[PDB]
Amino acid sequence: PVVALCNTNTNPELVDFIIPANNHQPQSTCLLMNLLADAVAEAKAMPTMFAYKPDEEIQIEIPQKKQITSQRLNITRNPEVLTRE
Amino acid sequence: ITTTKPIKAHFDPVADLLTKINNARKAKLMTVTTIASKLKIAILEILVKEGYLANFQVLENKSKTKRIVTFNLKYTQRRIPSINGVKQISKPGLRIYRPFEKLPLVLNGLGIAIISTSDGVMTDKVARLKKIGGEILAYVW
């Protein structure tokens, strides 16, 4: 079994437990990864981190380095493969 | 029911439907539409009776001058169809006529053979029961 955070560009056949999600946002990936880790940690019995928690404990920050930009750019680095004679 | 795209059909009524069904099966498409003819309506009725399709539904224009039939394939939960293949026998030009003695058995009885003898289209088993045969349209298994 393999679970994954599919992000609109993945082949659904390969993944068994598909989780439609984001993969580019460092907040979304963190939230979902920590949710899976929370499942694991609850099963192996420690206190949870994000699951079954209110807003004051689910809240998170946006890493450094208006709104956040989940836009895929840099198409100019996709030239035609070297050809011609 | 309202549509948006133009609807066209081939001149050959059996193989038009067979091509539509085969392409839908291969592409996992569920609902398809085509022009309605009475041979096609009867053949779709027997396919629905034999359980190879979910539903077939005929519709008529507001002026009662055009009729179109739309049908859906029967996919299971894991999305694999009940139809495995289609092959047409009585193509235009070479029409296949077989008496009762030579009525074919498709895939050792797993599939069905469409035969339009004298009472409209008719499955192979019921044709054998009635002891009479005729034109053989297509093999569906």
Added chain:
Amino acid sequence: ATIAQLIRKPRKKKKVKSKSPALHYNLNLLNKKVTNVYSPLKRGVCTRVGTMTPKKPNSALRKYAKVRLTNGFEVLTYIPGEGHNLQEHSVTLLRGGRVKDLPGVRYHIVRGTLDTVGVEKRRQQRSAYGAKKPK
């Protein structure tokens, strides 16, 4: 192709040619006509004896004979044996065959059936070469 196309011009089957054509021609000698009657083995008369060289790989001197049959065809025939009594003018009895080394040769001579003597000094596979049983 197409049912109509084959109805108009049906399938023509490729012809079949024999491997020993000269054995299936019969000359009447009264009306002087040649008819196609199949015959297993035919009598001929030799004209020139000698040796030929095998094609590419083999290297030897193989005994051939230009024999004219009871019909009007002259064929090059390989004498299958070690030593021969052919004297440029004799009657032999050709059968079908094909030696691979010599190009153009497509017949063999049955040994020890007619004027041509058999192959003595042979105890193995002699029934093919016409040798009396040692007893």
Added chain:
RNA sequence: AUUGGGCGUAAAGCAAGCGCAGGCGGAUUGAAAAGUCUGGUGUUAAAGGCAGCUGCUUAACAGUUGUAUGCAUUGGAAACUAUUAAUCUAGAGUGUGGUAGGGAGUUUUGGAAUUUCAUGUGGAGCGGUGAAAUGCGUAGAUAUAUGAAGGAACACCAGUGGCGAAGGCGAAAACUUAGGCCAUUACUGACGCUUAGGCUUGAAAGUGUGGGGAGCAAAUAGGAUUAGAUACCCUAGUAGUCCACACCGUAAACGAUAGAUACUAGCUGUCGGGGCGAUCCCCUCGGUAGUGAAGUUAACACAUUAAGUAUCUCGCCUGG
């Protein structure tokens, strides 16, 4: 290869088009029943084949019983094909309205550049090559400036482009003229697809008659290189290349892929019509390209402009 094969690169899609006969062909109603299915009857000689049995010591063999196929006639079935009598618009055309084009023919016009000739300045070379030599030049060449004549081809625009069925089409204009795309509450009402035979067009070379000839250049002559050079290089050079009228009818005439029709993921450009109204960009309908999954393939690759799922028609292939 009807059952039972193929034609991009292995043999095989005619160079392309207009197409008579033939083959195939939208939807609904009625009749008849030519195809199709089925019942009765007559017949399909005997021997032979298959099944059963008997007799030869069993067998081979002999004998005996059963055992199909097709044709004709008569009686029914009416789903499909064909025929006939009609209705309908969705295929295909026509009309009106938008509209893009190097589509074609005929007749005129224009400017750069080469060559020749004329007239001035000038004075030893120019040309050509790997290096040179034939060749041109003190009769003033090459160069420079002006002018005239004539012929052929039309820089830039010019394209990750447009048009035609193919060959093919690019300076400007006029006249005549062919097809195509988009939207149609309009009209005819299956009039359509393919096409053996037939007809039309068909790069360049080549032919015949008459014109034209600036440049280039098969054949030809000379100088080089070379063991030789009838070739590659150079200097000259006729036919030809150009126009009109008649033929020839072949090309790697290639997308190495016949035409028509329906269906099957997506993404990126570009060209035209239409919807909105600065451009740009958005949507719809089509043309032309790239990338790309299912699917196909021996592999390369094709992949909504198919080589995929299928049908129809024509042409073609059967080892070297």
Added chain:
RNA sequence: CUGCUGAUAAGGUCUUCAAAA
């Protein structure tokens, strides 16, 4: 930075084997 630069007699080995340890 384009000189020149042509030819090489005939036939041939070489995989025995996995049954198996």
